[PDB]
Design a protein around this ligand. Structure first.
Ligand SMILES: CN1CC[C@@H](C(=O)Nc2cncc3ccccc23)c2cc(Cl)ccc21
Ligand SMILES: [Cl-]
Lengths: 305, 300
């Protein structure tokens, strides 16, 4: 029993974290095989970050300008190239701790674990979701740029995020491992604002199934709804539309608990129009939207890595 | 900026997780140097779960009765001893991934990361607090016994918990790494109930200071209170008494935010009386009590 946020074990990723220093800027890099990946803004100064020409700044750099440190060992950079907003530093040594890995771009609503680092040293691990507005509600201080988000699939690490910046509202923005930003963001000091966020509906439904599996049933009701009537209500409360794919994905949880997806939707609809009435679900007074249907199944069944 | 419930990186602990099998029971063990630690109830049969005599069951066991598996490699048990509720299996190979470590017993209110394992394989990492009633609100299934709780404060792993059992209310009970249970619990299937839980007051105050550091000030008020008047109110809401030690511990946060501890205590009294009124603090509609003052300073 019990339901907790829970991140993937971070060991496979910790063996990849290195410190990347260029001039006065020090941030984190991901060392996989003979390449170190990090945000390209490491090559920037204060004048540069206002309006940067990364191709021009990078062409003026030499390999010895990048100081890469793996533990107490300095790696030597033998090449440098840029792919979108990520900088690739070729090193002479392949990381002996390189796990089986893949670079994957995730969709809003999908979850991943963040290994927060400072000076190439992992300090914490937390689970979060790619918000529908493409920000993440992370926890990051200065020097955490280059910290990565990942998932584990069997013995394979899927790297899906690298931290680049913090928006004025305290939310975070970053890229996949190919340097492509999640969201309408750019890697420079300029006026940027995250769009109005929405609730990840399929994730709330998955978390309601997790609550039923844990014995919390007070919110269940006799009612069912059409997908169209539910979505008309969902749109109204700033909730993401629920697609037929989401309904299909909730299938195993629906089969396990005996509560059809549209029946759980009718519980969610009443919960939105009426509230919790001083009650809690899994110790929470708010509907949790950072557990996907796969996360709920994995945790309420014990899949290991 | 931002505030998250955050576990320590689990890598140093993952390299220590092994599978321990005795008869039909299979659970997790912690392999440090040439010793594998695990709950002593791994030696228990169906007949010996209500009133097991562990000294008697252990004396009937031999080293070849314990099957230890580290990855796909079977370790050879060359000795067995019991320390309180923990079983120590001496092995013929020292763990090459053994980190710098210590065994520490924690106090209620203290937080730690849990590496949940099944069959010696880590499946997830999460954050816990030792509840005032000495239980933990974990997320554990059958097979998770021997999963450990730890803190990694600079380089060294402090092992503070080993999972042993689930109580009828879905909460969890376990021991430190010397086999001493946290709480009035025994490793028997006898009728056991956790005491009524209470909110860890000092941790709620630390989390209110974290919210002020992050710019959330709506709950602040112009009131202060005496420690005694605060404790009289807080206890009516099943909150733990706040001692002078707790007030002293909140000192750096008080100095950083400019809000005296007794002033923040008055904001806490107001919150308990009014509720949140549809507002949230750090994205939460409830008062969070699983961030200690040390956690808040570290994360901020
Ligand atoms: C009654 N019983 C069963 C096996 C084991 C037990 O509770 N272990 C389990 C661990 N973590 C979550 C669980 C979730 C569902 C079931 C078991 C769980 C145990 C251990 C002791 Cl020391 C005494 C009794 C006892
Ligand atoms: Cl949690």
């Amino acid at each position: 029993s019990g339901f907790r946020k829970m991140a993937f074990p971070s060991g496979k990723v910790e063996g990849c974290m290195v410190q990347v220093t260029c001039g006065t800027t020090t941030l984190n890099g991901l060392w996989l095989d003979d390449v170190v990946y990090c945000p390209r803004h490491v090559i920037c100064t204060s004048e540069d970050m206002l309006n940067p020409n990364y191709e021009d700044l990078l062409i003026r750099k030499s390999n010895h300008n990048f100081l890469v440190q793996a533990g107490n060992v300095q790696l030597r950079v033998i090449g440098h190239s840029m792919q979108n907003c990520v900088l690739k530093l070729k090193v002479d040594t392949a990381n002996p701790k390189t796990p089986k890995y893949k670079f994957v771009r995730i969709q809003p609503g999908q979850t991943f674990s963040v290994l927060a680092c400072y000076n190439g040293s992992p300090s914490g691990v937390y689970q979060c979701a790619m918000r529908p507005n493409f920000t993440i509600k992370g926890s990051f201080l200065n020097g955490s740029c280059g910290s990565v988000g990942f998932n584990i699939d069997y013995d394979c690490v899927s790297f899906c995020y690298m931290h680049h910046m913090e928006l004025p509202t305290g939310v975070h923005a970053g890229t996949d491992l190919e340097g492509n930003f999640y969201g309408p963001f750019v890697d420079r000091q300029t006026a940027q604002a995250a769009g109005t966020d929405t609730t990840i509906t399929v994730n709330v439904l998955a978390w309601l199934y997790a609550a039923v599996i844990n014995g919390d049933r007070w919110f269940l009701n006799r009612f069912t709804t059409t997908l169209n009537d539910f979505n008309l209500v969902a749109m109204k409360y700033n909730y993401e539309p629920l697609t037929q794919d989401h309904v299909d994905i909730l299938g195993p949880l629906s089969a396990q608990t005996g509560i059809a997806v549209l029946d759980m939707c009718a519980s969610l609809k009443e919960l939105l129009q009426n509230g919790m009435n001083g009650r809690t679900i899994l110790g929470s007074a708010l509907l949790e939207d950072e557990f996907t249907p796969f996360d709920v199944v994995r945790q309420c069944s014990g899949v290991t890595f």
